Amino acid sequence: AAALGSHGSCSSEVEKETQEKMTILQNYFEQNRDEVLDNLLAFVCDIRPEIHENYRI
Amino acid sequence: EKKEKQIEQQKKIQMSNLMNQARLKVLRARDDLITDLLNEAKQRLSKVVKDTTRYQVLLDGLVLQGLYQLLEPRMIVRCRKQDFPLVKAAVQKAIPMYKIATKKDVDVQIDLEAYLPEDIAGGVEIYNGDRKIKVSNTLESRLDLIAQQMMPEVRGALFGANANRKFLD
Amino acid sequence: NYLSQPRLTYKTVSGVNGPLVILDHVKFPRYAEIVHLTLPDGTKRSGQVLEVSGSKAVVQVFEGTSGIDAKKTSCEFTGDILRTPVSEDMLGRVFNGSGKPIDRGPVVLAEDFLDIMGQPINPQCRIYPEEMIQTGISAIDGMNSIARGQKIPIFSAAGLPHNEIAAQICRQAGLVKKENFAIVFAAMGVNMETARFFKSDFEENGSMDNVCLFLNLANDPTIERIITPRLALTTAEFLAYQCEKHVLVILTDMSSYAEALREVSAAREEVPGRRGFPGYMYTDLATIYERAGRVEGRNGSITQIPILTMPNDDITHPIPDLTGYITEGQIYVDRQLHNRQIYPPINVLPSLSRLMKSAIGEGMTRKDHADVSNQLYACYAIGKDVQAMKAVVGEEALTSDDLLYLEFLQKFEKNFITQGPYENRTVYETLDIGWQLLRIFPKEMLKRIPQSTLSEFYPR
Amino acid sequence: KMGGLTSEQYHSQVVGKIGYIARCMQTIDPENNLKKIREDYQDVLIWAEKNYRFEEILEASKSGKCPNDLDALSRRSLILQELLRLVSSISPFKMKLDLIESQYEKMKQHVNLWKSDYHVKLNQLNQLTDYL
Amino acid sequence: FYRLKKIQEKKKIIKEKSEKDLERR
Amino acid sequence: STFGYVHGVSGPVVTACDMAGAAMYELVRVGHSELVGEIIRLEGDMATIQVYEETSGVSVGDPVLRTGKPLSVELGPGIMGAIFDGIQRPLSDISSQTQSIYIPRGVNVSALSRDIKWEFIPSKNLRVGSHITGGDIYGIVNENSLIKHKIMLPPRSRGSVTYIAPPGNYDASDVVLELEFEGVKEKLSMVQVWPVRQVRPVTEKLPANHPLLTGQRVLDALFPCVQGGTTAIPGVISQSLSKYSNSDVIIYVGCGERGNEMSEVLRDFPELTMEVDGKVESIMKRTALVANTSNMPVAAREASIYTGITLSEYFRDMGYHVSMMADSTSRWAEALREISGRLAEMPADSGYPAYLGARLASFYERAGRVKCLGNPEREGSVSIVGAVSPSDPVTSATLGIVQVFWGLDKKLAQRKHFPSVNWLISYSKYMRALDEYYDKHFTEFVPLRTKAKEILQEEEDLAEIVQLVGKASLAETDKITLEVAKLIKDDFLQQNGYTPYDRFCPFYKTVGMLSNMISFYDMARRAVETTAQSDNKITWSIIREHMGEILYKLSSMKFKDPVKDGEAKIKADYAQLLEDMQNAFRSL
Amino acid sequence: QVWPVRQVRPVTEKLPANHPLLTGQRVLDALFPCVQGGTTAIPGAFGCGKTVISQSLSKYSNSDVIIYVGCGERGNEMSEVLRDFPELTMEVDGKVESIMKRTALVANTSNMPVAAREASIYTGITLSEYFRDMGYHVSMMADSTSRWAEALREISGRLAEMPADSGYPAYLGARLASFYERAGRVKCLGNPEREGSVSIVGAVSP
């Protein structure tokens, strides 16, 4: 009977901890999302063509 | 005692299965957010394509960068049909800088008979004269190629550094 | 900095043979580079450049060459060597031999990308290991004791219970009391029942949140075995030397790894070593086995336990032979003990641990531990010689002293070696089971033991 | 590699089980009489009864919008199948709805319904029935 | 012995194809 | 050309082109990271290069910078207490400059520091216009408390002195000497460079005639070794020679050693000490190490031997006695087998190259006692101890060359008897050379050595027959021979390596113990033989009953500690036991 | 339906084996048991009884289907099976039925083309996996796997490949191991939730 009760208690706390962790990720993401995108596109749009360093005339 | 120990063994296994699912839910939540960020990056690039002055400044570089990988006597550029005048201008700017940098003469042609699909955000593919070798230089090629190499840095920028990682060396 | 420049894609495939694809017209080829192959039906495979010459490159394909052709199949060259993603979130995950997930979780969001060959650690910067791992098994802890940071294989054979010894070490290992391990587990060429057994045991122990599994089963591609130990050990080196964990690494058949090398070497038509294995087999195995131990100024460690299936029970075969020239011992699992239902079937005579000499004794465990190990060994060696003589001459030829050795040989196998799968014995229980056997003899026979050790521990 | 399957095989088996669960539910209960089971299976029965296409529920399975664990769906599926076998093997006669709900609850609580003596008793009825 | 032959043969074929390429140079 | 280009790569082997001026065994620097490699085949304008570092990521068209020199080693001040790579990279400096646990690929550090200032004193008899020749000592550096580092004109250098620096402090970059010959000038610092594959020359090799004491009674008594010796051993002795020997300088080469065992040596040696002029000093002041763990590149494994022997010939030339230990000549022959296979060569026996015995003999024949080059009359030596790690081709090739061989017995090792050396397959060919030293300094030992080998061989035949007949038939003289053979095996040949009283058994202790055991054998056998043909007949049981205290004293003779007790006490205690034996036999 | 013989037919899940494959021998069934989903080897010199054990197991075992493979072995050892199995009967519902109604055979005798012995093995295991997927318990007999290893040695020899042990190709162990991994007990694909198995009993001719 104690085992059967303890399983539901563990499931409850594991669920609430899952919801807390997922909430924290979405807050840390939205606080940083635009700063990351502005660096990704700065690398994408800055082309800088180069020839391989082993090339010889 | 044997029956009690079997209940103890069952408790460990059942709780373990809950915790394994709970870890995987939190990990899937991150990769969903990362995938949504890469979808916003694709949308942000799709505006640069409509901004035809900046799109020419990209597309001038996307052609010349492909020519410097291939280094062939003759090459073929494949492009999105709607962009043909912009890539035709980019080829004419690329050829003198190619001859100056490589010291080699070149013939560069643009496909009129086949094109990249309208689904493609923009950019080009460049082919060898017999099409057995290519360099693919679409905006989706650059977005992916840069985004994967940045993954250690977007993890840290979005979610903060791991407190247990005492050394970087 | 990044590789910001585009990737060349070639349809210039020129030959296909066994695990190898050969390309030509390749621009400035790079040795050890990674290649991604798209087949005519859109299947994606991956491979590595084993040789370069002029415009020609030879690629080993990890998932095999079936369905590849000389015209439609195309290779994209990545510009770089093989770097795996790593993170601390890899503990409590399951991956295949290529490092792709099989637990239905996502791919690794990296904390870093590491070269799977690792980087040479300076011999000046290593620390000599002296903490004993109490494995809980008397035939190990009493006579073949393991230091934390050692390399020590299990040598075994077909039908023997080496998986149970490995699982029992993973359940029972800890330090001697007068920390608990992160586990990295690799499988090359295992059957489904072996993979299920280990995964089920870590779940039965309720500890999967502290272990990482890389699985290549006997139906998975054989050339993935070339990278599977190197994915596992690159993960263990991040966890140990950057996250400061104590790692135990299990590599569950080095014999099925060595066969994947022989396929690639045979397909390349290289000059053989013994039994057809590569001439460089020692130098290759050493790159896996020397990724272990401790470093100065960092708190983590890696302990290595490889497992070998020896063919025909031949310990002189090139696989177990070369492993002894690199690792700090062996534990030997014996068919003659297994046929008698002894467990563990460990034979203490061919077994060895080279780092035990400094891990045991006063301040470490107990002051008698060196002497008792030597005397138990000498008694078993003599008793096995008396047993071998007796079968020629019959018991009427044996002296009373020969019957003391022949009695000891039974009591040792029945009480000291025999243990059972979930019994855990301390070093102290291991030593004091040992003394109950050394009391079979009068004091004058115990020649390996000095009078101070006899005087203090024999009368009890 | 999800379970042992490719991703396409794995999500395609999920859609197959969601459909088969609905076919079992309609053949146990053509009339919506059996409310308790139709509530306990609501999370999968929402996709059926409605008009929808295989290709649409496949995107929902890839998105994780519908249920998509083959371990859970196989357990859910088997309990309807082993109840449908009882209901179909007792062909001319009828059980009462509270007896049916009692058998369902007894099955749902069972550790391994495939290993059950209930499964053996049903195999023995089917063995007589197929001869007759 | 059978593996020390065959390696000789593969070397002989490589030397022949090498010399027969010098006839094109 | 001055640089070629990489044409192809396959493991540690590189092929390069535009290499037209290249010479066999030139070093080159490969790739943009400048990895060291050595040239090993030439075909027209192409070269094949054996790379000493990992080649992963090397590309076709990469540079190959063509250096002018063969594989060669820096010789001069700063070698004592150093830890080196097989190729002479300084592991303690690389650790300090990089601030990291790793070795960088293509790392460049000079093997001898140019930052440290050394106290230099010229020979004072030299003045401008003096004539000097290769091997001439022209100054001394006070490198250490134990080692005066003689500064020598390089072999093949010669001429008339044009400048010679005053006493003072100098960098290894500073010009301390200048000289002229045929109007050409040389400017010289305290550091020279020598090719590791070339034997350093000498005036004369000399016969080896003085023992090289080792702490272990088996090796000192039954199978002697000599200063300038060549020895092969199973792979105790490493620490033993290092802390206790007649040798001035020790060089240890960990050729193909296990990671955690190399780490033992590198931790352990700097803690060890010796007593010098009534003062205690670290042995690291007279030691240098070459470390090469089993995962390091196969070509560096091969070079690690040539580095250590060249460093040994360099201290030989100063007139020191040097001891070299090579931790496996078999793990070295493993590298030759791999490199030979990568080059498509035909093997001889068991896949080894057919030149394996020439490669071994060229290494071992660099040992010996010598009269050094150049003007101050000197002697020095190199003694080589080579571990062998098995019948097989490496053992078979080694036994054609070495003057001493110590074989293991698995019966001794598995009975936990130590040192586990087999006294019936082992040999030493130095015994006639040493018998004049034993005649000069001991006189009694040659009879004792002889009789001990007879007892140990006679009992080995009895030990076959007693397996058939169960001891009952055996005569009392022959039982005496079984039981005294056991005394020798357990109380003389057996030796605990860790206990202070037997950590190092000096030769006056070694002769003392055996002299008493052979004196017992004579008297015990004489008592039995003298009472044949008689109503009273003596037996081993009668002697054992009458003389149990003498057997207890004889078995206890090993416990005398040469750190606690002096020569006079240890001799007097053994001489009192010899009188107790004689009195007991006279009382029978 | 048509399936590639070199590719494993999928399943929902492999399961632990929990039930004996009864052979009707006193030895074997008492001393050395086997299971529905098991893997067995029968090594032995000529005349020991490998084919008689294979035939006895084919006639009398508790299996729903038998697939019998005779790669590289005698034509009379195939002809005996065709002569016997129509006459021999098991009993169903108080009625007798010929055991040839539950049997399929794959013949490629010791004088038929050497290269086809590889195709016999993969045909017979693919036929066994097909009936496993129906929820049957199947047994496959492979009356010598040495004849398949010996066929690989000739093809490998004429392809001029480097040999491993005693002339065999280095891939021989991978070809064997991936064949024996097709045995097992399973939850089948698809939705009627049935379970089935394949046992493999490979004879070896050292």
Ligand SMILES: Nc1ncnc2c1ncn2[C@@H]1O[C@H](COP(=O)(O)OP(=O)(O)O)[C@@H](O)[C@H]1O
């Ligand atoms: N179980 C058996 N009972 C009776 N005779 C047997 C039995 N097993 C083998 N034999 C005899 O031995 C012969 C050879 O058996 P077979 O299976 O063909 O051996 P092989 O291993 O060479 O294929 C049979 O034809 C039969 O005469």
Ligand SMILES: [Mg+2]
């Ligand atoms: Mg047969």
